[PDB]
Design a protein around this nucleic acid. Structure first.
Lengths: 144, 149, 145, 149, 149, 148
DNA sequence: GTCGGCAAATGCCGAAAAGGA
DNA sequence: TCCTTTTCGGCATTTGCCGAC
């Protein structure tokens, strides 16, 4: 299907995970956080990074990622209530998905919206070469 | 290092902003930066920064009390290592925020607004400790890398 | 085809459109605004209605709307740049779609995010009964407010 | 018409909040409301409202100047029709916001925060004119109906 | 804009009528209208309106007493926010009734004569409150839609 | 947050040692660490760290002068935010080095050995600036990458 | 009314030589 | 050589009155 990323970089290297941690990973692994919708990614970034729309960075880029439907994705274990406040658990699960190198994608639930699914993208997986990326520019009719 | 994650483009941006903010050449090495901090900073530079609206007077006080800075400038003494380190933390967080956000106004606004991650404290207030400065850096790099979930 | 709405009511009547207007319609016609993704609807509401998360209404509800594949859609004309600041034009096109009653759904672009498509829903089309609605609750692991 | 838009219990809750805030019966007709406004509200009600923290002093001054209010109360005078209509505007907007938002803190907060739709003015500041009051009403109904596109 | 956007093609006619009554452009935004009301309307426009036969002296003094009107015209200050708001309410329902009935004469006759719904009060008097203004607007809307009994 | 770059169990070992050095709970948040620094650490803990040989007397003097320390102890005052900041820097680098080398002895020796990259300065001397602390962390991570 | 600054004596910081192992 | 003990010199900055916005 189609995934959406919001980041200063227009690649899928995800090298910042080698020295920066997140909710779904510990520093030292390359990783890319993506969403299923541009509003999804934008809302996640605005809420969790605490950015006001008047302070939205001008270096930020929206990247559309297209993958074939044959790609491999790993299933996340069932999550009991409280996981949104247990970063150790989510970081451990993401680290296990990344180091096992079993699949290219990991669907995870959103912590701010129900029925919303974000995705973990492992660039070290060999299927990360079939990704086609293009930047979708923010137009004056697409402001915040 | 900071440049490795910060993407040589954005890293050059950060070094240029840091040179403009603290007169540290953009090609100096990290040890050169450490030495410049230990050698001390001129109080003249701090009063110029606060006069150019770069630092709020309360931020200047967080770096050093006003009467102490007056004693420094009268005696023509460089800032102490801890005062210079507070100043460097301020200017370095400012430079990284301007490198990530792309504009000084948005960066300063984001640094001056309270954060729920800091229990209602602004990033500029986090610069009193090593760990707080590190948390601000982590947040900036999370913004830059798109770790928004 | 699944649509997402955020409103203080758990129906598809849209009667409030008979008194209050939106970006895509003028008052006097019933209409339902919806998004293709719950974060889409949430971002639209929060930005255009200027609601902080600490003030998010308790009355608000998130509705999943399931429609059959035979549902009818209309096509919006080619818009020229600057339409996000021309509410009269958007209201004109939405009023035209709602009055012609030619289709149930109208795909519209978003004024916030590129490549994002919101939807107008006409509760007076004969296909509005085929809609199946359900409320998605806000759990503390799926909340921002 | 309003009771047609405010569905489920919106209108009932709005009338209950008006009864609590302005001693206006829930079953009173709109003409009864108009006549009650023309008859004049007591200044004691206004001072009780501002004491209980329903209105801020600046909002009370928007309703009526302090000197005029003290004159009215020490003369055992009801408020004029324009003062009563301003207070009714405040109470109507407050009750409508509490009906749409579902609780008191959220409603008053949203009414007390600047909006870019109002060029950085708060909805309570928009309550100086018929037009601003109707704009606040339109915003509240857009919220209730989900017109966020 | 609360209850005046409910007519087919009547909204632009209403805006044109309002532009004839007050200097308010057809394309002016609602916030612009609010700022025009808060800037203060000129009393010269009010005396010109009561001369041109759209406001009777009693309908004029309902907006501003004659003494205060002489004070304004002499000392050269525009109408206060409340006086300008009453003038705007007058012109607003006048433009609305003109758009509904299609002519100024029948609109003025309907506005100036008492109506039973209001227990023997003219719609212009109902402009003393927010509620009475809304009632007049609802009545005009019912007339425009072709409602029966 | 370069301590998080440590592999497998490193960070956990870093938090255990840091808990033994400065009584910082292993699952405490980074903001809680900031709060602990701002509230000030007990000077008695610093004196005990010197007594147990965790710090050398010159290291303690660099953290806080001795007269000032005795004043803190008598007046029953926690350490200031910058004295506590230097103490935290010392304990943090010590715990990181102990997690990298796996033993207090080698770690303390590597921390007290001058380095060419630092113009003949020891890593413990590099803990006077944010940049020097970052350089020490980077060197520790370089060592841990190519284990040595 | 808020935010910011100025300067005197209370109060803090720690230098420095002399002493101890 | 390495480190401590205390002396008051001397640094540091509160604290309240008084300016700027």
């Amino acid at each position: 299907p189609i995934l959406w990323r919001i980041s200063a970089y227009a690649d899928l290297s995800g090298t910042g995970g080698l020295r920066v941690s997140g909710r779904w990973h510990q520093a030292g692994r390359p990783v890319v956080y993506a969403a299923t919708s541009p509003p999804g990614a934008m809302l996640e970034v605005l809420v969790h990074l605490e950015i006001d729309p008047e302070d939205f960075p001008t270096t930020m880029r929206l990247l559309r990622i297209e993958l074939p439907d044959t790609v491999s994705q790993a299933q996340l274990p069932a999550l009991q209530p409280g996981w949104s406040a247990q970063p150790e658990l989510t970081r451990t699960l993401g680290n296990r998905f990344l180091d096992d190198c079993s699949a290219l994608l990991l669907p995870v639930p959103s912590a701010i919206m129900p029925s919303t699914t974000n995705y973990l993208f492992n660039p070290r997986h060999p299927q990360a070469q079939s990704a086609k990326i293009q930047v979708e520019d923010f137009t004056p009719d697409s402001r915040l | 290092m900071l440049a490795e994650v910060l993407r040589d483009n954005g890293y050059h941006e950060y070094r240029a902003r840091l040179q403009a903010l603290l007169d540290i050449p953009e090609l100096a090495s990290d040890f050169e930066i450490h030495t410049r901090i230990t050698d001390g900073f001129a109080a003249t530079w701090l009063v110029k920064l606060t006069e150019r609206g770069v630092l709020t007077p309360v931020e200047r006080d967080q770096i050093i009390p006003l009467r102490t800075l007056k004693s420094r400038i009268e005696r023509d003494q460089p800032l102490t290592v801890d005062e210079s380190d507070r100043l460097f933390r301020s200017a370095h967080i400012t430079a990284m925020a301007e490198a990530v956000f792309g504009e000084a106004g948005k960066a300063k606004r984001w640094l001056s607004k309270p954060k729920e991650r800091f229990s209602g404290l602004t990033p500029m207030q986090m610069l009193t400790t090593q760990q707080g400065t590190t948390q601000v850096e982590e947040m900036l790099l999370q913004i830059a890398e798109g770790y928004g979930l």
